[PDB]
From a paper:
One of those enzymes is the mycobacterial monoacylglycerol lipase Rv0183, also termed mtbMGL, hydrolyzing monoacylglycerol (MG) into glycerol and an unesterified fatty acid (FA). The biochemical characterization of mtbMGL showed a strong preference for monoacylglycerols (MG) and suggests it as a secreted lipase. mtbMGL belongs to the family of serine hydrolases, with an α/β-hydrolase core fold and a distinct cap domain. The active site is formed by residues Ser110, His256 and Asp226. In this work, we determined the crystal structures of a surface-entropy reduced variant K74A Rv0183/mtbMGL in its free form and in complex with a substrate mimicking inhibitor.
The complex structure of mtbMGL K74A, with the bound substrate analog Maglipan, mimics the transition state intermediate of 1-oleoyl-rac-glycerol (1-OG) in the active site of the enzyme. The active site of serine, Ser110, and the central phosphorus atom form a covalent bond; fluorine has been replaced in the nucleophilic attack of the hydroxy group of Ser110. The backward-facing oxygen atom O19 of the covalently bound compound Maglipan is also coordinated by two hydrogen bonds from the backbone of Leu39 and Met111 that form the oxyanion hole in the active site. The short butyl group of the substrate analog faces toward the end of the long cavity of the active site. The central phosphorus atom of the ligand bound covalently to Ser110, and the extended aliphatic chain expands through the hydrophobic tunnel formed by residues Val147, Ala150, Ala151, Leu154, Val163, Gln164, Gly197 and Leu200. Cap helix 1 (Pro145-Val157) and the residues from the subsequent loop (Val163, Gln164) interact with the tip of the alkyl chain. In the complex structure, cap helix 1 adopts an intermediate stage between the open and closed conformation. The ligand dives deeply into the lipase to the active site within the core domain, whereas the end of the alkyl chain still projects into the exterior of the substrate-binding cavity. The loop regions of chain B are poorly defined, and the B-factors are higher than in chain A; the average B-factor for chain A is 35.9 Å2 and for chain B, 56.0 Å2. Nevertheless, there is density visible for the ligand in both chains.
Numbering used by the authors: 2 to 279
The structure:
């Protein structure tokens, strides 16, 4: 039995960051710090934290600024460092509450881009990285001219909606898409320029920065992902400095592998990967 507690801290710029803590009723094996994707929130990951809890893992999952229960203007960010700083603070919170426990940083989509940028900047603040379709190659979705424009707009008008997303691409399960379509805490609009710039900054420097990752890395990706092409994850595992890197491709799965029909096989692979290394 894994149980959720809701807590908070003061993030960068004194924005209240809400985060959940999922504690299992068994002896804690290690801690997981989880970063959700664009426009979603940590409560869409309940079933993930429960599955990890059944493996004796404590899961820290924060609502990013402008997301879910956290403060700030909705999906507003002026720099990727705002996300990575709030994630860094959350990693430190788990490090102090569970000292000596191994630390697993886990990110999905934009969360995967934040976990990546956090990791290459603090490659010894964590022990294991798991990335679910990380948004580390956003510049492959637009022309270079559009990337020049989006970076500039992310500065001047970070709140301007700039890019529409196909929400039907998140899952092959129509129930998942409809539950996403009707979630009051999900951003039901377009990608803003500020987040567009942040993802583009991470993407252009991913090849040059990835060598800084030295901890074991697990990348998960569905082959039929229309939001983030799988080639972005193939280029990532070819570019990281980690010796123990692995990409699990899931034939036919859509973007959110954690919410797919095959999600239990996906999470079985995550637990199996973590337990060989803990
Ligand atoms: P993840 O967080 C999954 C959430 C979506 C259900 O992110 C998925 C992919 C996000 C990529 C967004 C596009 C990044 C670049 C967009 C900027 C280009 C638009 C600029 C137009 C200027 C004329």
């Amino acid at each position: 039995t894994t149980t959720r507690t809701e807590r908070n801290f003061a993030g960068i710029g004194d924005v209240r960051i809400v985060y959940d803590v999922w504690t299992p009723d068994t002896a804690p094996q290690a801690v997981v710090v989880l970063a959700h994707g664009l426009g979603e929130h940590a409560r869409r990951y309940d079933h993930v934290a429960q599955r990890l809890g059944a493996a004796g893992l404590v899961t820290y999952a924060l609502d990013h600024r402008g997301h879910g229960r956290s403060g700030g203007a909705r999906v507003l960010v002026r720099d990727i460092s705002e996300y990575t700083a709030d994630f860094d603070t959350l990693v430190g919170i788990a490090t102090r509450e569970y000292p000596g426990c191994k630390r697993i940083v886990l990110g999905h989509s934009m969360g995967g881009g934040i976990v990546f940028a956090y990791g290459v900047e603090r490659p010894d603040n964590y022990d294991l990285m798991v990335l679910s379709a990380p948004a580390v190659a956003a510049q492959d979705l637009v022309s270079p001219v559009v990337a020049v424009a989006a970076k500039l707009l992310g500065v001047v008008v970070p709140g301007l909606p700039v890019q529409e997303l196909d929400f039907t691409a998140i899952s092959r399960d129509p129930e998942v898409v409809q539950a996403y379509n009707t979630d009051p805490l999900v951003h039901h609009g377009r990608v803003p320029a500020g987040i567009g710039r942040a993802l583009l900054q991470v993407g252009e420097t991913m090849p040059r920065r990835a060598p800084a990752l030295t901890a074991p890395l697990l990348v998960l990706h569905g082959t039929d992902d229309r939001l983030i092409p799988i080639e972005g994850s193939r280029r990532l595992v070819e570019c990281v400095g980690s010796a123990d890197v692995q990409l699990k491709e899931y034939p036919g799965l859509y973007h959110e592998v954690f919410n797919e029909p095959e999600r239990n096989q996906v999470l079985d692979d995550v637990v199996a990967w973590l337990t060989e290394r803990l």
